[PDB]
Structure formats: structure tokens, C-alpha cells
Design a protein around this ligand. Structure first.
Ligand SMILES: CCCCCCCCCCCCCC(=O)O[C@H](CCCCCCCCCCC)CC(=O)O[C@@H]1[C@@H](NC(=O)C[C@@H](CCCCCCCCCCC)OC(=O)CCCCCCCCCCC)[C@H](OC[C@H]2O[C@H](OP(=O)(O)O)[C@H](NC(=O)C[C@H](O)CCCCCCCCCCC)[C@@H](OC(=O)C[C@H](O)CCCCCCCCCCC)[C@@H]2O)O[C@H](CO[C@]2(C(=O)O)C[C@@H](O[C@]3(C(=O)O)C[C@@H](O)[C@@H](O)[C@@H]([C@H](O)CO)O3)[C@@H](O[C@H]3O[C@H]([C@@H](O)CO)[C@@H](OP(=O)(O)O)[C@H](O[C@H]4O[C@H]([C@@H](O)CO[C@H]5O[C@H]([C@@H](O)CO)[C@@H](O)[C@H](O)[C@@H]5O)[C@@H](OP(=O)(O)O)[C@H](O)[C@@H]4O)[C@@H]3O)[C@@H]([C@H](O)CO)O2)[C@H]1OP(=O)(O)O
Ligand SMILES: CN1C(=O)[C@H](CCCCN)NC(=O)[C@H](CCCN)NCc2cccnc2Sc2c(Cl)ccc(Cl)c2CNC(=O)[C@@H]1Cc1c[nH]c2ccccc12
Lengths: 338, 316, 239, 238
């Protein structure tokens, strides 16, 4: 049982690839048209075109779910309108096996999504930001009961204008200190110069002390949680959790990233169920229109629930994985109706 | 009788498409605004007013596109159900059916002119005023849970925040002056179980209180002063935008042919991308007219280029 | 009135599907356009109707050239067309369906338009269902309403596409009676259909098209006697 | 082997299109399911095939109930189906078309799969066009390839949907010969078609469905002699 599987997989994969290419081209064009309204003297149209071109991997990563949805719709529509699925069933091949073949096709897009997220996006995104603008300042942070302010931090491992306040467990001042310059030496410890201090004044030419800030994560502060790769996001969240309180937006980013392949597979399954169900014996244009509506609805629901997770108390896991489970159940039921 | 049939079908389908596109676009914008409010940058209670005020500006785009899509759908259905075949076989051509809809196109043109000349400037004036009112947010208005928020000389950290932006917990506030507080509730902000320090002075409190353009101008002003390129561009864009209804009618008539096997929805995507080509050309010829490069005359010409092109195409 | 078609030809995908098809028809005469499926009869019929642009040939109607005229212009000259698939205006009433085409007549006014509507409704016996929508009528009554609507334009030649498709033997007699009524009305009927047996029963003259060209012509008896059609189209045994 | 269908019924838009349709068929027997267009024959046929969910009735195949089984499960039990419209895999070779269904057989291996492919190609005389794509073949050869592909699954009963649609009188003889070959192979053929004249010529047993119920049954001569079918379906002459 490989010839039919090979045929279905080839058709669906070619449909997905063509849809992905077309959507990437359209998004690049539309993003350029959008980024033609922010031109400045130091930011010309060529600079905008380069900025949009460098953002192509990010647009591709964001388009993969709807791309897979539309690819499944078009491939199975080509198979069905030609009355191939009817004969496939009439020889004993079940619906779930066809869905399994289409999922085999979509796993390539899932792998490409992982590769882009973990290897490609953090580089081209940085290049695009560098092009648009042309390693952090004013950074506040907490270490348990300590509050730290660093006016300038250099990822090479330097700090300028350090201020630190240490409180008692009862929130009473334990100490305060300032420093002109500082240098990381070992994990969790920094030397520094001009150590003015007060305790519950004092001065010192040079002294070391322990603080948890590390050069590794300094550059991550200016980057939005969503744009972080999975490795960077997990490492930064582990660091923050072990040393401070992790913000809810980072949890939302983590749950939205972990659920991406599941979202893609569930959307593909919904597409297949629609082809076998309501969208049987329908014009290819109608199938494409319904696929676009499903994609827009999914994106809007995902964004709205992510924000509602931020606004509301319970964990973002529910708000993120509810649509996936509900759509999977709906598609499974629609497949049960045959 | 055929005129009333076409008019009813087109009005029904065009209203459905207009409602659906309005839902799509401003649901997207509503979700973006909700996310911004989720970041504390905007009052979640007023964003509905923002959507209401921006209604006319999105309708300005949706109504031509909605009418175009409705015409395409109606004529595609006529072709698919062989009604167009019998209409042709009775001596009624496609161009004749397109001409029979001219009164409806004029009605839609009048409606869009009303939106363009009065409703859109009013909506964008109210929206600009409301945005200016909302943009002065600072301090506790921008506070986020488990994060440090810096505005002006103030920096705030809060450990928790309710569904409504009230009842903070674990409040830390920095200027010289430093303040800590077990609880707070919102510039008149109450702080409960808090301590104050100066950097040497110290104090305690169980309760304390802190205390820390052209697109919207009316047509009345713009009808004259054509000498200024910005006003020239705007007023030309208001005067010559409504004829996109006529251009949409004629181009939809030109591009509507489709065989029954292909389906009703086959030629929506290419036709919509041609119409979005008109829209983009216009949104470009505007930018230039403003920077004083192209001149106002370019507005009707562009339309004519998309008009004649349709008129010839329908007559091949 | 005589409609003459000469040297039609049409090619798809660089393959000549129709090559030098020609025939003639007259008002009050039933002519069949038959042949093996996909051999040219359907494409030639659509070339005559106007749905498909002609690559070669000419069409004349009493020294009036219809070659360059579009479909609706031909219809204005008196060439009506009845499609195989349903074509009744779905959301319009049957009375409205006929009146819509009646209003297109420049030589009538309201009173005689209404009188013509009444006569057509009585003639086709669909008067009792005049007030119902087209989408909610049976197949036979819908077809009769379509034929009445086509007659409302007063065509001189009526081109029927597969009138016997999906028709049980009980209603074939009624359809034949309808076609004979059109003939009696002075309208020359050009029928194209797969059901050769019933088409040859009424057609006064028949043309057989094979390999994209006309291979036989004459009365149905002459067609049945022809050896080439028997060899390629009808087979050794047929009646 | 006997396929028995009892008391089928199906309703659309709160209208009962099919009411108490029942019949029986046997392997090596040709049964026709005829009647006025839209009177129930097509819906009943699709209910038997499995395309349309059944609202009432039962189906048995030698004391094995097929009522609740889905389409593919019925096919696994030996019920093949030949659609009216083209169903050849467009972008697959004809040899590939047959081999795809052959590979689904659990009781065969590569050598006898190839041998069966060779026998089917020789039997249907489509061997000379074995290497061409399905989308680039003529109607008759395409239909023969479809029938060979259907036989590749070794069905016990074959349900044909309008086998004579769009077929000239010259090829009706070839199609009849093909159907008789299926009969000789031991496969009971259930034919549904509008062309009653040619269907009654070969069918050994025929059921006429009118008003959603079976009104006549028996040999074609018995059907032609029946007064009710003449009154409602066949007319006074035939
Ligand atoms: C002549 C007569 C009359 C006729 C003509 C009259 C004139 C017409 C025009 C005037 C009236 C319009 C009024 C107006 O104004 O209309 C604006 C919007 C409409 C403009 C249209 C103009 C005419 C064009 C031609 C018209 C004819 C077609 C409002 C506005 O644009 O608002 C602006 C808003 N722009 C949009 O929303 C784009 C708009 C879209 C328009 C821009 C592209 C134009 C293309 C033109 C061709 C289209 C052909 C169809 O989106 C939306 O309409 C929502 C979705 C709409 C869905 C429609 C579906 C229809 C089909 C339905 C099915 C059949 C903008 O977003 C920013 C980015 O945010 C997300 O990315 P990030 O999160 O930041 O990463 C979006 N990503 C997203 O949403 C989506 C995500 O990526 C997910 C990825 C995939 C999504 C899509 C999947 C499918 C893709 C392919 C589909 C084919 C990005 O998407 C982008 O980059 C582009 C991206 O490919 C998105 C899609 C683009 C194409 C459209 C697809 C729609 C779905 C189709 C499905 C079939 C987007 O760029 O933020 C600004 C604020 O910026 C500031 C601030 O000022 O505070 C400062 C910034 O610095 C920054 O900080 C920002 C911050 O984000 C906080 O807000 O804040 C807003 O400023 P504002 O104006 O003040 O509000
Ligand atoms: C300078 N521009 C804009 O600010 C327009 C008008 C906003 C107010 C409408 N009420 N919006 C945008 O850019 C924003 C980007 C947000 C940046 N923060 N979203 C995209 C967009 C919305 C509407 C029209 N086009 C575009 S993108 C585009 C497209 Cl499709 C084709 C060509 C070009 Cl050149 C562009 C870039 N944009 C512009 O040239 C417009 C020109 C303009 C000035 N006044 C207007 C009033 C109405 C319509 C257009 C204009």
C-alpha cells in the first residue's frame, strides 16, 4: 500500500509547496507596500525592500499553518472533483488512512517550521532590524529581594552605572550600593570599581560581589518574547524562573510556540474533514474561499485568546490549547459522519 | 423585471459581502486594539468607540470592494445556472445587464460620496481627538504584572493585577524617592501597607495617596486652497474616489465570465487582485500628488485607464 | 427562411476536433445533428449557437451573414437556444419568467404582452402553476416553462441541446409532441442529442458527423440504410 | 452468495424520497434497478453503495449484516462500485492504476501481483496503452481500465452506475460483452441506468422503483408485460 499513498502525498505536498510560495510572495509584496509609508531621509525605498526581504523567513514561518490548510484543501479537492476519493473508498481504503497520508505530507511543513524557528528566524530578523535601524541600556531587574538598575550593559560582559538595593525579608532596607563600572568574572559574580555602599557611608576602589545577571541573556531583553526562538525562550524562562518571577507574556509565548505543530496538524485534519464532509461536490473556488475564511478565523481566534490570556488570570495553556482540541474534536466528528 | 431581479440579487449579495468584510477587517483591528489594551497602553473600555469612529474609514474601502465582489458573484451565478445563456439567447447581452445596474451604481456612488466627504473626516477627527486623549497615559496606567515599566522619571513594578486594571499587589516605585507597598489601587492612587525612603529619610504608612490632521479636516475648509499640494491631494482623493463604484461595476462586468464547471467563485481572486491594483495605484498617485510631483489631474486619468481597459475587454 | 452553415472547423489543444462541417436547415423543418460522442456534433452545435468562437467557416440566414455576430446578436436575428441543463430563473416566478422575456419585445405593449403571456400559459398547460417559483417545480413542467420562455422571444430557429436526456419513455411522447408543435408554429428545430433512436423518429432531415466531418445526410431511412454510419456509428443491428 | 436489501427508506428536506425499497441479488446474476428518473432508483442505489447514510432498513450478505458498516468496510466485504463519471487516477499510469489496487490485497505477493496485473491487462486488451497516463486515454479504454482496476480488488458484487451513459450504439455491444464477462467471472452485477431498453436486454432480473417503492419485479419479459410499469414508466408502446 504505497502507490496510492505516494500519489496522495505527492499531490498534497505539491499543493502545499505551491500555496506556500504564492503566499510568501504575496506577503512580501504587501509588507513592502505597508513599509512604503515609513520612508525617511536615511531610510529609502531600497532599504525598505531589503528590510522586507530579510523578513521573508518570518513571514514563511507565520504562513505555514494556513499554507498547509489551503494545500490540503486544494490537493483533496483535486482528488475529489476527479472522483478519485470515491474509488479509493470503494476499494476499501478508509478515510482515516487518507488523512494519515495528508498528515505525512504536512509533517514536512512542520519540520520546516521547526528549522525556521530554531535556526533561521533569529538571524534574518536581526539582520532586518539592523538594516531598519542603521547591548542594552536602562535595564531594571530583580533578584529575589534585591532590585538592580544598570544604565548600560555590554554583551561582551561590561556594566556601567550600576545601582543595587538589598531588602530584608520584612522589606526593610538591608543595604544600598552604587558602582561606576563592572565586569563579569564567574557565573553569578562580577568585579566592579567605585563601590559606594550604605548598610543598616562606605566606599571602595574595587570589590567583587554576586549578582545573577549574565551576558548570555542581555541581548534577549530588547527582543519581544514572541520573536525569540524556542531554545532562547526556554533558556531565558528557566533563568528568570530560577532567579525571579517569569512574566505571563513569556508563558504565553512558550505555549503558543509549543502548540504550533499541533495547530498545523489539527488545521490540516479540519481541511480534510471539510473536503470529505460539507465541501464535497463544490467548486474549487468555493473550497479556496472557505479555506481562507478558516485560516483567518483561526489566526484571529489565536490572537484574541492569547490577549485574553494576558488580561485574565488563568494560565495561557487553556487559552492556547482550547481551540486546538475543539477543532480536532470537530474534525474527528465530521470524519465520523463520512 | 430583469432589472429588479439583478438589483435584488446584487443588493443582497453585496450587503452580505460588505457585512462579512467589515467583520473580518475590524475584527482584526479590534483584536489588535485588545492586545494593546492587554499591554496597558490603551483603555479597553474606549476601543469600542475607536471602532465606531473608524467605521466610515473602513467602509470607504469595503463598499467599493463589496459591490465589486457582489457583482462578480451575481454574474458568476448567472453563468453557472445557465441563466446567462438564455438571457443571451433572448437578445439580452452581458453589457446590457451591466447597463441595467447603472442606477444602483449611482446610488452606491452617492453613498460613498457621503462617506468620503462628511462621515470619514468626522470619524477621523473624533478618532484623532480620542487617541490624543489616550496617549498621555503614564505611570500606573502602563503598569504590567511582574515587569518593570519606566515612564519619565518614574519606574513601577507590580506583582499582580486583576482583570480590571485595579488592585495592584507588590508595588515598587522609584523616582531619589523610593516607595514600597503591599497593595495599591488606582494619578490619584491609594497605597496600603507601604513604606517610603529617601536617597537618609524613612517613613511608614498604612494608607497613602500618590499624585504623580488634513485627513480629518472638513470639506468646508478644503473645497478651496487647491494651491497647496496637500489639500489638493486630499480634496482630489475625496472628489475622485466615489467613481471607484462605477469603475468596479464596469470592471466586474468585464471580468465576470465563467464556465459552469469552473464555478461561481473561480474568478474572484484575479479580479480582486486587479481591483486592489487600482486601489494601490490610487494610494500611490495620492502620495505623489501630495509631495508635489504628479498633480491632481492624475486621479481621473488613472480611473480612465482602468475604465477604458475594462470597456475594451468586455467588447472582445 | 433558410439557415446555411458552411465549412465549420474548430481545434482544441492543437487538435482539429471539427473539420469542414456543413449543412442547411429551413423553417418548419426538423433537422438532427447526430454522431459518435465527441466526434464533432456537440462542438459544431455550440459553434452554431455561439457559445464557442468559430475558427473557420461561415453562417448565413437568407443572405444575412451571422459569421461575425455575437450570440445575442444572432438571438436578435431569430436564433433561440434551449440548454440541456436547467435554465429557469430560480428565484423568479414562472409568469415572471415568461414576462421578463416578453418585455424585451419592442413590437409589443403591455396589453398584448399580457395576452401573449396568457396564450403561452394556456398552450403549455402550466397556467395552474403560474404563481410558483421556478426552483420549486418538477422537471417536465420546468422544461415546458423553459420552452414557453424561449418562444416568448419569437425565434425563427430553435436549437435544442439534448431534449431527451434524463427523460423516461412515458414522457418522450410528450416531448415529441412539443417538438412537433414548435414545427407546426413555423420554427425550424435543430436537435442535438445522444438518444439517436428517438431523435431519428421525428427529424425530417439528419446529418451524421464523424471524425469531425459530415459523413451522411438525408432522411432517417436513408441514414439507417447508409453503410458507413452502420459501420462506425449505429452498428450492424439497430432499429 | 446473496445480497439482500430490506425496507430501505430515505428522506430529503422532510420529504420521503425512498419508502420501503427491498430486493435481493446473487453472485453470477445480473439485476437491474430501474424506474422513473428521481423516483428512488438512484437514491436506493447510493444507499446500497454507501455514499448516502441510510435512515431505515437493513442490508445482509449471507447472514453478515452490512447495515452499520461504512463504505470502505462494505468494499472490504466484496462490494465494488463503478461510478458514472470518470474515476481513473488522472496523473497515474494505467499499469500504476491497477497495481495501486492490487497492492491493497493482503493475500498476494509481488510475483502474483505482477501476474494478476498481466492477466488483467491482457483480458481487457488495454496492454498496448499500459504505459500512458489515465488523463490521456479515450473513453472506452478508460472505462475498461476502470473496470479492470475495480476487478483488481476481487469484488463479489459490482454496482454499476449508468454504464451506458454517453455510449454510442456501436459500443453498447462491447459494454454488454464486458458485463457478461463479469457475470461469467462469478460477480453479481447490479446495474442502475436511465437507458432501460439496453439494460433490460441483459439483466436476468429487474426491479422497477416508482414513488419511492418497488412496484414490479421479475424477468424483463415479466416487467414488459406488467401493466403498472407500462402505465407509469414505459408507456403503452416499447
Ligand atoms: C479610491 C476610492 C476608495 C477606495 C480606496 C479607499 C482607500 C482604502 C484604504 C483606506 C481605508 C483603510 C483604512 C485603513 O487604515 O486600513 C488599514 C488596513 C487595510 C489597508 C488596505 C489599503 C488598500 C489595499 C487594497 C484594498 C483592496 C484589497 C489599517 C492599517 O493598516 O492599520 C495599521 C496596521 N496595519 C494592518 O493591520 C495591515 C492590514 C492589512 C493591509 C496591509 C497590506 C495591504 C495589502 C493590499 C492588497 C490586499 C489584497 C487583498 O491588516 C488588516 O487589515 C487586518 C486583516 C484584514 C483581512 C482582510 C481579508 C479580506 C479577504 C477575506 C477573505 C476573502 C499596522 O499593523 C502592523 C503590523 O501588525 C501585525 O504584525 P506584527 O504583529 O507587528 O508582527 C500585522 N500582521 C498581521 O496582522 C498578521 C500576522 O502577521 C500573521 C501572519 C499571516 C496573516 C495573513 C495570512 C494570509 C496572508 C496572505 C493572504 C492572501 C502586520 O501585517 C503585515 O505586515 C502584512 C501581513 O502580510 C498581513 C496580511 C496582509 C495582506 C492581506 C491579507 C488579509 C487576509 C486575506 C485572506 C484572503 C502589520 O504590518 O499597525 C499600524 C499601527 O502601527 C503602529 C502605531 O501607529 O501604533 C506603529 C508600528 O511601528 C507598530 O508599532 C504598530 C504595532 O503593531 C502596534 O499596533 O503600531 C496600523 O496603523 P493605523 O492605520 O493607525 O491603524
Ligand atoms: C502614508 N499613508 C498611510 O499612512 C496610509 C493611510 C492611513 C490613514 C488612512 N485613513 N496607511 C498606512 O500607510 C498604514 C501603515 C501604518 C504605518 N504607521 N497601513 C497600510 C495602508 C493603509 C491604507 C492605504 N495604504 C496603505 S499601505 C500603501 C499601499 Cl496599499 C499602497 C501604496 C502605498 Cl505608498 C502605501 C503606503 N501608505 C501610504 O502611502 C498612505 C498614503 C495616504 C495618506 N493619507 C491617506 C488617506 C487615505 C488613504 C491613503 C493615504
Amino acid at each position: 500500500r504505497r502507490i496510492v499513498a505516494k500519489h496522495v502525498t505527492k499531490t498534497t505536498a505539491l499543493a502545499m509547496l505551491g500555496t506556500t510560495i504564492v503566499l510568501v510572495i504575496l506577503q512580501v509584496l504587501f509588507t513592502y507596500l505597508g513599509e512604503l509609508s515609513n520612508l525617511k531621509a536615511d531610510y529609502s525605498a531600497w532599504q525598505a525592500f531589503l528590510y522586507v526581504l530579510w523578513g521573508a523567513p518570518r513571514y514563511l514561518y507565520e504562513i505555514l499553518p494556513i499554507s498547509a490548510l489551503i494545500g490540503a484543501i486544494l490537493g483533496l479537492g483535486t482528488l475529489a472533483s476527479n472522483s478519485e476519493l470515491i474509488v479509493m473508498r470503494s476499494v476499501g481504503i478508509s478515510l482515516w488512512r487518507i488523512v494519515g497520508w495528508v498528515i505525512r505530507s504536512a509533517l514536512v511543513l512542520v519540520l520546516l517550521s521547526f528549522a525556521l524557528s530554531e535556526w533561521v528566524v533569529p538571524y534574518t530578523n536581526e539582520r532586518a532590524n539592523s538594516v531598519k535601524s542603521h547591548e542594552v541600556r536602562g535595564y531594571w531587574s530583580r533578584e529575589g529581594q534585591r532590585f538592580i538598575y544598570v544604565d548600560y550593559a555590554n554583551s561582551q560582559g561590561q556594566l556601567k552605572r550600576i545601582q543595587v538595593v538589598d531588602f530584608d525579608d520584612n522589606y526593610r532596607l538591608k543595604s544600598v550600593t552604587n558602582a561606576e563600572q563592572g565586569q563579569f568574572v564567574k557565573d553569578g559574580q562580577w568585579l566592579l570599581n567605585h563601590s559606594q555602599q550604605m548598610a543598616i557611608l562606605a566606599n571602595a576602589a574595587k570589590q567583587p560581589f554576586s549578582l545573577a545577571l549574565q551576558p548570555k541573556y542581555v541581548h534577549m531583553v530588547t527582543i519581544d518574547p514572541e520573536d525569540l526562538s524556542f531554545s532562547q525562550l526556554v533558556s531565558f524562562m528557566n533563568y528568570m524562573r530560577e532567579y525571579s518571577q517569569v512574566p505571563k507574556t513569556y508563558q504565553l509565548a512558550f505555549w503558543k510556540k509549543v502548540a504550533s505543530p499541533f495547530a498545523l496538524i489539527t488545521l490540516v485534519l479540519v481541511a480534510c474533514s471539510f473536503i470529505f464532509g460539507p465541501l464535497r461536490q463544490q467548486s474549487m473556488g468555493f473550497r479556496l474561499v472557505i479555506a481562507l475564511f478558516i485560516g483567518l478565523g483561526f489566526y484571529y481566534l489565536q490572537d484574541f485568546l492569547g490577549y485574553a490570556s494576558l488580561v485574565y488570570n488563568p494560565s495561557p495553556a487553556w487559552f492556547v490549547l482550547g481551540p486546538i482540541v475543539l477543532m480536532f474534536v470537530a474534525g474527528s466528528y465530521l470524519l465520523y459522519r463520512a | 423585471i430583469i432589472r429588479r431581479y439583478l438589483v435584488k440579487q446584487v443588493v443582497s449579495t453585496s450587503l452580505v459581502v460588505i457585512a462579512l468584510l467589515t467583520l473580518i477587517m475590524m475584527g482584526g483591528r479590534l483584536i489588535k486594539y485588545f492586545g494593546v489594551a492587554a499591554q496597558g497602553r490603551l483603555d479597553a473600555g474606549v476601543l469600542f468607540s475607536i471602532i465606531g469612529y473608524r467605521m466610515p474609514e473602513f467602509l470607504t474601502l469595503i463598499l467599493p470592494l463589496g459591490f465589486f465582489i457582489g457583482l462578480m458573484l451575481v454574474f458568476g451565478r448567472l453563468y453557472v445556472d445557465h441563466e446567462m445563456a438564455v438571457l443571451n439567447g433572448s437578445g439580452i447581452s452581458r453589457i446590457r445587464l451591466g447597463q441595467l445596474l447603472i442606477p444602483l451604481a449611482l446610488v452606491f456612488l452617492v453613498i460613498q460620496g457621503i462617506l468620503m466627504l462628511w462621515m470619514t473626516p468626522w470619524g477621523l477627527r473624533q478618532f484623532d481627538q480620542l487617541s490624543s486623549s489616550q496617549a498621555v497615559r503614564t505611570g500606573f496606567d502602563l503598569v504590567r504584572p511582574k515587569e518593570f515599566i519606566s515612564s519619565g522619571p518614574y519606574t513601577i513594578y507590580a506583582g499582580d493585577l486583576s482583570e480590571d486594571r485595579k488592585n495592584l499587589k507588590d508595588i515598587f516605585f522609584y523616582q531619589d524617592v523610593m516607595i514600597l507597598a503591599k497593595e495599591a489601587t488606582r494619578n490619584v492612587v491609594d497605597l496600603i501597607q507601604g513604606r517610603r525612603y529617601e536617597i537618609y529619610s524613612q517613613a511608614e504608612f498604612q494608607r497613602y495617596r500618590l499624585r504623580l490632521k488634513v485627513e480629518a479636516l472638513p470639506s468646508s475648509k478644503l473645497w478651496n486652497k487647491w494651491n497647496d499640494p496637500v489639500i489638493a491631494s486630499e480634496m482630489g482623493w475625496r472628489v475622485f474616489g466615489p467613481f471607484t463604484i462605477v469603475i468596479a461595476l464596469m470592471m466586474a462586468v468585464a471580468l465576470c465570465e465563467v464556465s459552469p464547471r469552473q464555478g461561481r467563485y473561480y474568478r474572484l481572486i484575479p479580479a480582486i487582485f486587479i481591483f486592489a491594483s487600482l486601489i494601490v495605484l490610487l494610494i500611490a498617485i495620492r502620495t505623489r500628488i501630495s509631495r508635489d510631483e504628479l498633480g491632481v489631474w492624475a486621479y481621473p486619468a488613472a480611473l480612465a485607464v482602468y475604465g477604458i481597459a475594462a470597456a475594451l475587454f468586455s467588447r472582445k | 427562411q433558410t439557415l446555411c452553415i458552411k465549412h465549420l472547423a474548430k481545434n482544441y489543444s492543437k487538435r482539429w476536433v471539427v473539420k469542414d462541417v456543413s449543412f442547411e436547415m429551413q423553417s418548419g423543418q426538423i433537422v438532427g445533428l447526430l454522431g459518435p460522442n465527441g466526434a464533432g456534433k456537440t462542438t459544431s452545435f455550440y459553434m452554431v449557437v455561439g457559445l464557442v468562437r468559430m475558427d473557420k467557416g461561415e453562417i448565413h440566414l437568407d443572405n444575412l451573414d451571422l459569421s461575425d455576430l455575437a450570440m445575442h446578436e444572432r438571438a436578435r436575428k431569430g436564433i433561440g437556444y434551449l440548454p440541456q441543463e436547467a435554465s429557469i430563473f430560480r428565484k423568479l416566478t414562472i409568469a415572471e419568467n415568461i414576462m421578463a422575456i416578453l418585455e424585451t419585445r419592442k413590437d409589443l405593449n403591455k396589453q398584448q404582452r399580457q395576452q401573449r403571456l396568457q396564450e403561452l400559459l394556456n398552450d403549455f398547460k402550466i397556467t395552474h402553476i403560474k404563481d410558483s417559483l421556478g426552483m420549486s417545480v418538477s422537471g417536465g413542467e420546468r422544461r415546458r416553462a423553459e420552452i414557453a420562455r424561449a418562444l416568448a422571444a419569437d425565434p425563427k430557429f430553435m436549437l435544442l441541446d439534448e431534449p431527451f436526456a434524463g427523460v423516461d419513455p412515458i414522457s418522450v411522447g410528450d416531448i415529441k409532441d412539443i417538438i412537433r408543435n414548435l414545427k407546426d408554429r413555423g420554427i425550424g428545430v435543430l436537435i442535438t442529442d445522444h438518444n439517436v433512436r428517438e431523435t431519428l423518429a421525428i427529424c425530417e432531415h439528419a446529418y451524421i458527423v464523424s471524425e469531425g466531418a459530415v459523413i451522411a445526410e438525408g432522411s432517417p431511412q436513408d441514414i439507417l440504410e447508409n453503410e458507413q454510419v452502420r459501420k462506425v456509428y449505429l452498428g450492424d443491428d439497430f432499429t
